[PDB]
Amino acid sequence: KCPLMVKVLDAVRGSPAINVAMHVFRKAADDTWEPFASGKTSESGELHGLTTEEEFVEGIYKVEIDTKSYWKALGISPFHEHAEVVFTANDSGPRRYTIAALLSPYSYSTTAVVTN
Amino acid sequence: KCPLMVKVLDAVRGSPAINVAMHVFRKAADDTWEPFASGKTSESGELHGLTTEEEFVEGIYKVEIDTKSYWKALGISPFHEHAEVVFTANDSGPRRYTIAALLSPYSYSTTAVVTNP
Amino acid sequence: KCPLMVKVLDAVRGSPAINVAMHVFRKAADDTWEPFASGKTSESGELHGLTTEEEFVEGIYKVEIDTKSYWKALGISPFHEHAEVVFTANDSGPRRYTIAALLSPYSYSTTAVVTN
Amino acid sequence: KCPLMVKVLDAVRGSPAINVAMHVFRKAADDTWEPFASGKTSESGELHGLTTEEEFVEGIYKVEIDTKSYWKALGISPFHEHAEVVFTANDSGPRRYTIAALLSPYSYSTTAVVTNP
Ligand SMILES: O=C(O[C@@H]1Cc2c(O)cc(O)cc2O[C@@H]1c1cc(O)c(O)c(O)c1)c1cc(O)c(O)c(O)c1
Ligand SMILES: O=C(O[C@@H]1Cc2c(O)cc(O)cc2O[C@@H]1c1cc(O)c(O)c(O)c1)c1cc(O)c(O)c(O)c1
Ligand SMILES: O=C(O[C@@H]1Cc2c(O)cc(O)cc2O[C@@H]1c1cc(O)c(O)c(O)c1)c1cc(O)c(O)c(O)c1
Ligand SMILES: O=C(O[C@@H]1Cc2c(O)cc(O)cc2O[C@@H]1c1cc(O)c(O)c(O)c1)c1cc(O)c(O)c(O)c1
Ligand SMILES: O=C(O[C@@H]1Cc2c(O)cc(O)cc2O[C@@H]1c1cc(O)c(O)c(O)c1)c1cc(O)c(O)c(O)c1
Ligand SMILES: O=C(O[C@@H]1Cc2c(O)cc(O)cc2O[C@@H]1c1cc(O)c(O)c(O)c1)c1cc(O)c(O)c(O)c1
């Protein structure tokens, strides 16, 4: 019953991206970003436990993934400072979100799988 | 001659993404995002002439593509509010940057092609 | 202990792609493709049980995914006849392979996560 | 004037993919793949002049990009043998096709942009 999960893959090595830091924010009434949650990806390239179904209310959310530090650790100079995923959550009721990020040094793709 | 251009494709239609609004910011000394340029893509899904070789100094830049408005205009309710590409530019000297975005309602990818003038 | 798994996602709807047919082949001595396994994706957009670690020997493999029939079922005329993933398997010993395909009507991406 | 072109980008380097070999086939009446055209990408990662508006009749075509040789030449051992794009062309009348491929060692994406002459 985890409603927000993030999965990061490394397209160069073909493996999960481990130890990728990410920060999750929610848009405040004053249109600024308020810190919500944070963590680092597991050995499976995943991050769970960001929030509970109860705390995860309708809102605009941002997931910032520190892709630059990941590549620098591997000795590669990347293009992006980080990867941002910005989205409206739960506007039609509660959903479970899996955000996937696929990383290359000069390119990334992000996809959402949203289920009921 | 143009140091920063953006190309946007539509993965649903198999076509350039037309009339996609974009905003560019540059990070100021104070750590805030200062507006830097804007525009919309043409019939070829491209936006050129955002800045000049002389004005586009070293800095951290953000290109914000209003993908949500793009999809809504087509009657589609997509996942993302927008697509944002944040990068340091010109730190090892001047380069030409092409930012390419490929859009689907629930997914997008972005790639940079960076070449030495 | 499943060594070859395929996961298909729909980038338009943001959901697993369910009931996508796929066929798996291995390159024969006579450089032709020999049928190996087949199936359709589950409600989770996944296909397992294609092979066992014992039967999955070093070889060149092809996974053909019938993306065209999937889109036609949804009333969309797609570009590709199907998506092909062609790769050498197990050349350095046994690995577990997860092949992911992300589908849009005029674009697809494929990624491999290979673990030990 | 050119009805079929291919653009290949390198997602590791942030650059066009140069000297990528490609082979195109067309499905024959007998269900076999008959060789149709070939070439390599230029310095701009593009391959043009594969066929002519007149020769590129309705059919099922396959573009096979030798991504494995590309990566090996760079010292990298990638996952795929090649990238293959199989599609029906010109079934609703003549169109112009651009096949775009974005390459990483363990991932690639391919997109078609199809426009009406
Ligand atoms: O400490 C804030 O962020 C932390 C530092 C930081 C940064 O330096 C640059 C950046 O790209 C992201 C970033 O995330 C950090 C962060 C820390 C957390 O503990 C956290 O829960 C989070 O969501 C994120 C913060 C505080 C704020 O009060 C605030 O309004 C805000 O927008 C942000
Ligand atoms: O009508 C457009 O597509 C069709 C309607 C549609 C939709 O309502 C919601 C959605 O999730 C997907 C979607 O795909 C439809 C579609 C139908 C086709 O026959 C087709 O070949 C195709 O590429 C696609 C269209 C036009 C456009 O001009 C456009 O840019 C675009 O992205 C899409
Ligand atoms: O956003 C600012 O203006 C516009 C409104 C707007 C918005 O409502 C939401 C959003 O996602 C983006 C956004 O971009 C707009 C914008 C317009 C421009 O003409 C422009 O050059 C630009 O950089 C951007 C802005 C930002 C700022 O950070 C700022 O300090 C300021 O004075 C102004
Ligand atoms: O029956 C063969 O394939 C089946 C029909 C078929 C097709 O018509 C077009 C196409 O794109 C793919 C395709 O896969 C089918 C198939 C069926 C299976 O049961 C299977 O295990 C498999 O791998 C795949 C076959 C037999 C052969 O003897 C053979 O050499 C071969 O290459 C293929
Ligand atoms: O040396 C090239 O990259 C570096 C070496 C390398 C490798 O040995 C294996 C691998 O898995 C990835 C890889 O990334 C390296 C890399 C280093 C950088 O500093 C960098 O900015 C970058 O984009 C990347 C190179 C040159 C190229 O000309 C090229 O086309 C290419 O794709 C790559
Ligand atoms: O592959 C044929 O020639 C070349 C060798 C070759 C290969 O070893 C492996 C592979 O992945 C692709 C491949 O393409 C080659 C090829 C060369 C060309 O000049 C060409 O126009 C073409 O379509 C293709 C071929 C295929 C056939 O199906 C065929 O009937 C034939 O007579 C010949």
Side-chain angles (χ1 to χ4, degrees):
Chain A
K1 297 189 83 69
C2 193
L4 182 63
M5 350 197 306
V6 186
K7 176 83 173 184
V8 191
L9 297 185
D10 174 334
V12 175
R13 309 198 297 166
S15 70
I18 301 137
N19 257 40
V20 181
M22 61 187 74
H23 299 99
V24 184
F25 302 84
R26 179 170 45 217
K27 217 234 247 317
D30 28 289
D31 274 47
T32 63
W33 289 109
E34 290 311 305
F36 181 68
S38 72
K40 282 169 149 297
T41 55
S42 77
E43 298 278 337
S44 59
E46 307 190 58
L47 183 51
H48 309 293
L50 297 167
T51 194
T52 57
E53 290 192 311
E54 164 189 278
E55 262 299 328
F56 195 35
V57 301
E58 309 168 359
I60 296 175
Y61 290 82
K62 171 160 73 164
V63 173
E64 247 177 57
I65 305 173
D66 183 6
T67 59
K68 186 175 192 175
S69 300
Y70 176 79
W71 291 117
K72 287 166 53 174
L74 291 174
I76 292 168
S77 193
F79 175 77
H80 300 95
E81 288 295 304
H82 58 249
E84 294 197 15
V85 175
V86 176
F87 65 102
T88 294
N90 300 311
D91 48 350
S92 299
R95 295 288 192 275
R96 299 192 162 74
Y97 295 83
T98 294
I99 295 160
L102 177 65
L103 312 181
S104 297
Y106 270 69
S107 183
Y108 69 81
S109 83
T110 188
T111 303
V113 175
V114 181
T115 56
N116 226 139
Chain B
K1 74 284 259 297
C2 194
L4 179 60
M5 55 227 115
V6 182
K7 211 294 152 63
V8 188
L9 301 181
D10 179 325
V12 171
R13 202 47 159 175
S15 64
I18 309 320
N19 285 304
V20 178
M22 270 174 228
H23 310 279
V24 186
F25 304 76
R26 184 180 180 274
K27 206 164 132 193
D30 73 349
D31 212 57
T32 73
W33 289 114
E34 89 163 16
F36 182 80
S38 54
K40 307 159 108 84
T41 58
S42 65
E43 333 293 339
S44 62
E46 298 170 336
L47 173 56
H48 292 98
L50 281 163
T51 183
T52 60
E53 180 97 333
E54 178 137 81
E55 167 199 18
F56 189 42
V57 290
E58 172 176 0
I60 297 170
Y61 291 80
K62 173 160 77 177
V63 180
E64 172 185 296
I65 306 169
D66 188 9
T67 56
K68 179 171 188 179
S69 288
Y70 175 81
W71 291 112
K72 286 287 189 177
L74 282 168
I76 289 161
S77 290
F79 179 70
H80 302 89
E81 292 295 303
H82 46 250
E84 288 175 288
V85 184
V86 180
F87 61 101
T88 300
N90 305 134
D91 61 38
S92 314
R95 297 292 191 271
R96 319 273 197 196
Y97 295 89
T98 297
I99 300 296
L102 174 73
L103 305 190
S104 295
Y106 276 70
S107 186
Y108 64 80
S109 87
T110 182
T111 299
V113 178
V114 180
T115 67
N116 190 334
Chain C
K1 297 189 83 69
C2 193
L4 182 63
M5 350 197 306
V6 186
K7 176 83 173 184
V8 191
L9 297 185
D10 174 334
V12 175
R13 309 198 297 166
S15 70
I18 301 137
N19 257 40
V20 181
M22 61 187 74
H23 299 99
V24 184
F25 302 84
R26 179 170 45 217
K27 217 234 247 317
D30 28 289
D31 274 47
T32 63
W33 289 109
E34 290 311 305
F36 181 68
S38 72
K40 282 169 149 297
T41 55
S42 77
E43 298 278 337
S44 59
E46 307 190 58
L47 183 51
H48 309 293
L50 297 167
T51 194
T52 57
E53 290 192 311
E54 164 189 278
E55 262 299 328
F56 195 35
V57 301
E58 309 168 359
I60 296 175
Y61 290 82
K62 171 160 73 164
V63 173
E64 247 177 57
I65 305 173
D66 183 6
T67 59
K68 186 175 192 175
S69 300
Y70 176 79
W71 291 117
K72 287 166 53 174
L74 291 174
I76 292 168
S77 193
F79 175 77
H80 300 95
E81 288 295 304
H82 58 249
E84 294 197 15
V85 175
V86 176
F87 65 102
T88 294
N90 300 311
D91 48 350
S92 299
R95 295 288 192 275
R96 299 192 162 74
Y97 295 83
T98 294
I99 295 160
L102 177 65
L103 312 181
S104 297
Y106 270 69
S107 183
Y108 69 81
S109 83
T110 188
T111 303
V113 175
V114 181
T115 56
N116 226 139
Chain D
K1 74 284 259 297
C2 194
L4 179 60
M5 55 227 115
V6 182
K7 211 294 152 63
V8 188
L9 301 181
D10 179 325
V12 171
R13 202 47 159 175
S15 64
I18 309 320
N19 285 304
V20 178
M22 270 174 228
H23 310 279
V24 186
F25 304 76
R26 184 180 180 274
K27 206 164 132 193
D30 73 349
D31 212 57
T32 73
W33 289 114
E34 89 163 16
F36 182 80
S38 54
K40 307 159 108 84
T41 58
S42 65
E43 333 293 339
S44 62
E46 298 170 336
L47 173 56
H48 292 98
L50 281 163
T51 183
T52 60
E53 180 97 333
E54 178 137 81
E55 167 199 18
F56 189 42
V57 290
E58 172 176 0
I60 297 170
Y61 291 80
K62 173 160 77 177
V63 180
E64 172 185 296
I65 306 169
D66 188 9
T67 56
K68 179 171 188 179
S69 288
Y70 175 81
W71 291 112
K72 286 287 189 177
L74 282 168
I76 289 161
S77 290
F79 179 70
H80 302 89
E81 292 295 303
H82 46 250
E84 288 175 288
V85 184
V86 180
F87 61 101
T88 300
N90 305 134
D91 61 38
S92 314
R95 297 292 191 271
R96 319 273 197 196
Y97 295 89
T98 297
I99 300 296
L102 174 73
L103 305 190
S104 295
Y106 276 70
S107 186
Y108 64 80
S109 87
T110 182
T111 299
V113 178
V114 180
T115 67
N116 190 334

PDB file of all heavy atoms in Angstrom, chain A residues 23-25 32-38 64 82, ligand 1:
ATOM      1  N   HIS A  23      14.815  14.185  -3.799  1.00  0.00           N
ATOM      2  CA  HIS A  23      14.062  14.998  -2.879  1.00  0.00           C
ATOM      3  C   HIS A  23      12.690  15.223  -3.468  1.00  0.00           C
ATOM      4  O   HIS A  23      12.568  15.481  -4.663  1.00  0.00           O
ATOM      5  CB  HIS A  23      14.771  16.322  -2.661  1.00  0.00           C
ATOM      6  CG  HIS A  23      16.143  16.176  -2.075  1.00  0.00           C
ATOM      7  ND1 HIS A  23      17.286  16.216  -2.842  1.00  0.00           N
ATOM      8  CD2 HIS A  23      16.549  15.973  -0.798  1.00  0.00           C
ATOM      9  CE1 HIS A  23      18.341  16.053  -2.062  1.00  0.00           C
ATOM     10  NE2 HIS A  23      17.920  15.900  -0.818  1.00  0.00           N
ATOM     11  N   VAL A  24      11.660  15.110  -2.635  1.00  0.00           N
ATOM     12  CA  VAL A  24      10.274  15.252  -3.086  1.00  0.00           C
ATOM     13  C   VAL A  24       9.645  16.482  -2.416  1.00  0.00           C
ATOM     14  O   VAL A  24       9.821  16.684  -1.210  1.00  0.00           O
ATOM     15  CB  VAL A  24       9.449  13.978  -2.773  1.00  0.00           C
ATOM     16  CG1 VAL A  24       8.032  14.087  -3.330  1.00  0.00           C
ATOM     17  CG2 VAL A  24      10.141  12.741  -3.328  1.00  0.00           C
ATOM     18  N   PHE A  25       8.937  17.304  -3.196  1.00  0.00           N
ATOM     19  CA  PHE A  25       8.378  18.568  -2.712  1.00  0.00           C
ATOM     20  C   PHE A  25       6.910  18.642  -3.064  1.00  0.00           C
ATOM     21  O   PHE A  25       6.464  17.943  -3.971  1.00  0.00           O
ATOM     22  CB  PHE A  25       9.047  19.757  -3.398  1.00  0.00           C
ATOM     23  CG  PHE A  25      10.526  19.823  -3.218  1.00  0.00           C
ATOM     24  CD1 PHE A  25      11.374  19.100  -4.045  1.00  0.00           C
ATOM     25  CD2 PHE A  25      11.069  20.644  -2.259  1.00  0.00           C
ATOM     26  CE1 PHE A  25      12.744  19.171  -3.888  1.00  0.00           C
ATOM     27  CE2 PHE A  25      12.446  20.727  -2.098  1.00  0.00           C
ATOM     28  CZ  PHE A  25      13.280  19.993  -2.919  1.00  0.00           C
ATOM     29  N   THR A  32       5.366  28.352  -3.725  1.00  0.00           N
ATOM     30  CA  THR A  32       6.747  27.932  -3.538  1.00  0.00           C
ATOM     31  C   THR A  32       6.767  26.433  -3.322  1.00  0.00           C
ATOM     32  O   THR A  32       5.735  25.840  -3.038  1.00  0.00           O
ATOM     33  CB  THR A  32       7.389  28.621  -2.323  1.00  0.00           C
ATOM     34  OG1 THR A  32       6.696  28.235  -1.132  1.00  0.00           O
ATOM     35  CG2 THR A  32       7.318  30.128  -2.474  1.00  0.00           C
ATOM     36  N   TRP A  33       7.936  25.817  -3.462  1.00  0.00           N
ATOM     37  CA  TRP A  33       8.063  24.385  -3.210  1.00  0.00           C
ATOM     38  C   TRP A  33       8.370  24.117  -1.744  1.00  0.00           C
ATOM     39  O   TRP A  33       9.327  24.664  -1.192  1.00  0.00           O
ATOM     40  CB  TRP A  33       9.146  23.763  -4.098  1.00  0.00           C
ATOM     41  CG  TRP A  33       8.732  23.688  -5.499  1.00  0.00           C
ATOM     42  CD1 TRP A  33       9.210  24.426  -6.540  1.00  0.00           C
ATOM     43  CD2 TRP A  33       7.710  22.844  -6.035  1.00  0.00           C
ATOM     44  NE1 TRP A  33       8.560  24.079  -7.703  1.00  0.00           N
ATOM     45  CE2 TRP A  33       7.634  23.114  -7.417  1.00  0.00           C
ATOM     46  CE3 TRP A  33       6.863  21.880  -5.484  1.00  0.00           C
ATOM     47  CZ2 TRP A  33       6.741  22.451  -8.252  1.00  0.00           C
ATOM     48  CZ3 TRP A  33       5.982  21.221  -6.315  1.00  0.00           C
ATOM     49  CH2 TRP A  33       5.922  21.512  -7.686  1.00  0.00           C
ATOM     50  N   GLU A  34       7.553  23.278  -1.117  1.00  0.00           N
ATOM     51  CA  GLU A  34       7.806  22.873   0.260  1.00  0.00           C
ATOM     52  C   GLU A  34       8.352  21.454   0.332  1.00  0.00           C
ATOM     53  O   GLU A  34       7.767  20.525  -0.223  1.00  0.00           O
ATOM     54  CB  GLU A  34       6.538  22.992   1.115  1.00  0.00           C
ATOM     55  CG  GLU A  34       6.096  24.436   1.395  1.00  0.00           C
ATOM     56  CD  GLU A  34       7.230  25.335   1.887  1.00  0.00           C
ATOM     57  OE1 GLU A  34       7.895  24.982   2.887  1.00  0.00           O
ATOM     58  OE2 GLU A  34       7.459  26.397   1.266  1.00  0.00           O
ATOM     59  N   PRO A  35       9.480  21.277   1.024  1.00  0.00           N
ATOM     60  CA  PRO A  35      10.067  19.945   1.205  1.00  0.00           C
ATOM     61  C   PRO A  35       9.076  18.969   1.830  1.00  0.00           C
ATOM     62  O   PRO A  35       8.357  19.325   2.757  1.00  0.00           O
ATOM     63  CB  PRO A  35      11.212  20.209   2.165  1.00  0.00           C
ATOM     64  CG  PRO A  35      11.587  21.627   1.916  1.00  0.00           C
ATOM     65  CD  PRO A  35      10.298  22.331   1.644  1.00  0.00           C
ATOM     66  N   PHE A  36       9.063  17.743   1.320  1.00  0.00           N
ATOM     67  CA  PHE A  36       8.021  16.764   1.609  1.00  0.00           C
ATOM     68  C   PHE A  36       8.713  15.494   2.093  1.00  0.00           C
ATOM     69  O   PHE A  36       8.464  15.028   3.201  1.00  0.00           O
ATOM     70  CB  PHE A  36       7.175  16.521   0.334  1.00  0.00           C
ATOM     71  CG  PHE A  36       6.044  15.538   0.502  1.00  0.00           C
ATOM     72  CD1 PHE A  36       4.954  15.841   1.305  1.00  0.00           C
ATOM     73  CD2 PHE A  36       6.045  14.327  -0.180  1.00  0.00           C
ATOM     74  CE1 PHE A  36       3.895  14.940   1.451  1.00  0.00           C
ATOM     75  CE2 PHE A  36       5.002  13.426  -0.037  1.00  0.00           C
ATOM     76  CZ  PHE A  36       3.921  13.733   0.778  1.00  0.00           C
ATOM     77  N   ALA A  37       9.615  14.964   1.272  1.00  0.00           N
ATOM     78  CA  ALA A  37      10.357  13.754   1.614  1.00  0.00           C
ATOM     79  C   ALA A  37      11.698  13.688   0.880  1.00  0.00           C
ATOM     80  O   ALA A  37      11.935  14.452  -0.052  1.00  0.00           O
ATOM     81  CB  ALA A  37       9.537  12.519   1.300  1.00  0.00           C
ATOM     82  N   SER A  38      12.560  12.768   1.311  1.00  0.00           N
ATOM     83  CA  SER A  38      13.861  12.537   0.677  1.00  0.00           C
ATOM     84  C   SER A  38      14.365  11.117   0.921  1.00  0.00           C
ATOM     85  O   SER A  38      13.839  10.397   1.766  1.00  0.00           O
ATOM     86  CB  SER A  38      14.910  13.530   1.181  1.00  0.00           C
ATOM     87  OG  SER A  38      15.288  13.236   2.516  1.00  0.00           O
ATOM     88  N   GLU A  64      12.788  15.502  -7.432  1.00  0.00           N
ATOM     89  CA  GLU A  64      14.078  15.941  -7.961  1.00  0.00           C
ATOM     90  C   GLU A  64      15.075  14.822  -7.730  1.00  0.00           C
ATOM     91  O   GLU A  64      15.241  14.361  -6.604  1.00  0.00           O
ATOM     92  CB  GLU A  64      14.566  17.201  -7.248  1.00  0.00           C
ATOM     93  CG  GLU A  64      14.605  18.447  -8.116  1.00  0.00           C
ATOM     94  CD  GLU A  64      15.033  19.690  -7.348  1.00  0.00           C
ATOM     95  OE1 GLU A  64      16.134  19.679  -6.751  1.00  0.00           O
ATOM     96  OE2 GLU A  64      14.270  20.681  -7.350  1.00  0.00           O
ATOM     97  N   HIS A  82      20.187  17.775 -12.628  1.00  0.00           N
ATOM     98  CA  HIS A  82      19.356  16.780 -11.992  1.00  0.00           C
ATOM     99  C   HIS A  82      18.163  16.561 -12.905  1.00  0.00           C
ATOM    100  O   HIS A  82      18.047  17.203 -13.939  1.00  0.00           O
ATOM    101  CB  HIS A  82      18.903  17.258 -10.613  1.00  0.00           C
ATOM    102  CG  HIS A  82      18.158  18.552 -10.634  1.00  0.00           C
ATOM    103  ND1 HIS A  82      18.678  19.719 -10.121  1.00  0.00           N
ATOM    104  CD2 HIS A  82      16.924  18.861 -11.101  1.00  0.00           C
ATOM    105  CE1 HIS A  82      17.797  20.692 -10.270  1.00  0.00           C
ATOM    106  NE2 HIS A  82      16.722  20.198 -10.858  1.00  0.00           N
TER     107      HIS A  82
HETATM  108  O1  LIG E   1      16.350  22.413   2.321  1.00  0.00           O
HETATM  109  C1  LIG E   1      15.730  22.481   1.268  1.00  0.00           C
HETATM  110  O2  LIG E   1      16.053  21.544   0.207  1.00  0.00           O
HETATM  111  C2  LIG E   1      17.192  20.732   0.490  1.00  0.00           C
HETATM  112  C3  LIG E   1      18.427  21.367  -0.127  1.00  0.00           C
HETATM  113  C4  LIG E   1      18.328  21.291  -1.637  1.00  0.00           C
HETATM  114  C5  LIG E   1      19.142  22.111  -2.397  1.00  0.00           C
HETATM  115  O3  LIG E   1      20.031  22.937  -1.764  1.00  0.00           O
HETATM  116  C6  LIG E   1      19.094  22.072  -3.783  1.00  0.00           C
HETATM  117  C7  LIG E   1      18.198  21.219  -4.418  1.00  0.00           C
HETATM  118  O4  LIG E   1      18.136  21.184  -5.779  1.00  0.00           O
HETATM  119  C8  LIG E   1      17.368  20.405  -3.656  1.00  0.00           C
HETATM  120  C9  LIG E   1      17.430  20.436  -2.261  1.00  0.00           C
HETATM  121  O5  LIG E   1      16.613  19.624  -1.513  1.00  0.00           O
HETATM  122  C10 LIG E   1      16.965  19.373  -0.154  1.00  0.00           C
HETATM  123  C11 LIG E   1      15.894  18.646   0.551  1.00  0.00           C
HETATM  124  C12 LIG E   1      16.115  18.162   1.834  1.00  0.00           C
HETATM  125  C13 LIG E   1      15.096  17.474   2.477  1.00  0.00           C
HETATM  126  O6  LIG E   1      15.273  16.986   3.725  1.00  0.00           O
HETATM  127  C14 LIG E   1      13.878  17.273   1.858  1.00  0.00           C
HETATM  128  O7  LIG E   1      12.901  16.592   2.526  1.00  0.00           O
HETATM  129  C15 LIG E   1      13.661  17.759   0.583  1.00  0.00           C
HETATM  130  O8  LIG E   1      12.460  17.562  -0.024  1.00  0.00           O
HETATM  131  C16 LIG E   1      14.670  18.447  -0.075  1.00  0.00           C
HETATM  132  C17 LIG E   1      14.592  23.455   1.085  1.00  0.00           C
HETATM  133  C18 LIG E   1      14.117  24.126   2.204  1.00  0.00           C
HETATM  134  C19 LIG E   1      13.061  25.021   2.085  1.00  0.00           C
HETATM  135  O9  LIG E   1      12.610  25.682   3.188  1.00  0.00           O
HETATM  136  C20 LIG E   1      12.465  25.245   0.852  1.00  0.00           C
HETATM  137  O10 LIG E   1      11.428  26.126   0.749  1.00  0.00           O
HETATM  138  C21 LIG E   1      12.917  24.575  -0.275  1.00  0.00           C
HETATM  139  O11 LIG E   1      12.322  24.805  -1.490  1.00  0.00           O
HETATM  140  C22 LIG E   1      13.978  23.672  -0.160  1.00  0.00           C
END
